[PDB]
């Protein structure tokens, strides 16, 4: 019996920051309206492609683990906002970092995608030859947004987080997990007309709907994550009080609170950074994990509960048993290219087109 | 030790057929030019979305295996042409078929994606709780093509293939596999400007380049598949002559022939259907497997070698040990919706725009 220890962690938040005040200059919103409704104060807007965010997060995780490019046998990029479909963007991260031969694929399960990727990499390593893996959640959600619709435009942001996993005989890393999907929730969170469903030669094809039915998402998310977390805990043999830290998807602080309340988990165990970055889909969990470690929230031998949901409606939970080390082996100097524009300036073309079309 | 037997197989080829003669009515080609160069006589053009092709193939595989919707715990759709990015299309197949709760994700590794999906599902089943899985390769490549460029427009088509896997103690299904990626080949097969790299509000954004460097693809494909097949065989303990059937990606018959020649595998062991369907990316292997079974090419207890490559440049090989049954348990009556248009008529808008832009 083998395990996949989380030996490296890293993040990449692009520098250009879009404040609530910035949003209020082109939408009928206020900092007060956005913060009360969402708990978000800021979010990041990338000046580079998704794959560039993924690359920097990966570099940080690699330095954190001290692994070489030869040692990496598997790369998974969890994303719903890839630069390209042909080829995938895991191969772009691979090209950028000069990693030979590793399997490289993109995994799409919306914001549950990092958890799906962690589950997938862990089992691949347990059942076959893979010695180390790189699992990245990376998104440029700002690509998708309808800048005339305040209820969705204020929720989402860009960023990436990564881990490195290393094979070990010690009982650490992801233990049990339950991942799933409530396909009866498929239509309540969706961009149905970006993809091959869209008309390639319709001049109005950029003005797609971003469907978001908040009350239904809340209900299905709490149900799906809750039952997954229960299945994992029940199988683990831990009592609820033995969970030390919760690392949740960052969609909505009230969902996190309801999840913990219904499970009987103390509210102060859940790591929250939604106020800084908004909902970055697949990136939420790995950024939160990296920052929890940075901030001293996770101790050696802690039990972590990971919980996430996303469009699909995908869902999942996982139990991680931490090992000995909570400190990076090395730091990376890796940085994104210079950002020469403010967030408002980055978004200008899209905002202007969305308004004109309206 | 558990295994993932292939208990169901199925396919969906959309009915609208684009002949070489059809292509010669709008391109500077002839049936003679296309056939001599490519070995392709026909290909299919879908009148429906990728997810609809995936659904029908899945229905056939499900009837073939006799599994219920409750029994299915995992759905992977291997595709580079999904209807949507938010949500994924595995969740659409799940919705269409009323499969509760199963994990559902899209996997992008270009034409090697079905093999990646088979590897992934098999190891998930071996290392954790998943009892049955649905793995689908499905593509609508016709969405992407530059109808003014004869060297690429004649190569690609649409379709889907599926398998059902079932957990067993018997040593059957995928045994060893080696999947990988030569990221030095990333730029020789690519559509860099469909995805979030594209300008959403550029009116010319539909007129993207389809990069295809044939000689370089050939070289890297033979190298990558060849070495993967060798690693699998060497680890298997089989001699080369003990491989009964080869199920290869259908990109180019000369690649298949070179692969077998260099490995010392008899040419008549490789199943070929490229003449009927062209290159359907992730769908090639599962359609070929389904048709090999249909046509009596695979016997109980055969050793199969699967080999594939795709944009990335992704690559892989796998050894499958067949079990007892090569016959479906049941047939499905599932059909696509009525196709009211010829292939030429389906493509008319895109051809006309590509020509006008030129
Ligand atoms: Na504990
Ligand atoms: Na044999």
Curated annotation (Swiss-Prot), chains A, B:
Its EC number is 2.3.1.180. Homodimer. Gene3D superfamilies: 3.40.47.10. InterPro entries: ACP_syn_III_C (IPR013747), ACP_syn_III_N (IPR013751), FabH (IPR004655), Thiolase-like (IPR016039). Belongs to the thiolase-like superfamily. FabH family. It catalyses: malonyl-[ACP] + acetyl-CoA + H(+) = 3-oxobutanoyl-[ACP] + CO2 + CoA. GO terms for biological process: fatty acid biosynthetic process. Its main location: cytoplasm. This is Beta-ketoacyl-[acyl-carrier-protein] synthase III 2. The last Arg residue of the ACP-binding site is essential for the weak association between ACP/AcpP and FabH. GO terms for molecular function: 3-oxoacyl-[acyl-carrier-protein] synthase activity; beta-ketoacyl-acyl-carrier-protein synthase III activity. It is found in: Cytoplasm. It comes from the Bacteria. The keyword Transferase applies. The keyword Zinc does not apply. Pathway: Lipid metabolism; fatty acid biosynthesis. Keywords: Acyltransferase, Cytoplasm, Fatty acid biosynthesis, Fatty acid metabolism, Lipid biosynthesis, Lipid metabolism, Multifunctional enzyme, Transferase. The active site is at residues 111, 249, 279. Residues 250-254 are annotated as: ACP-binding.
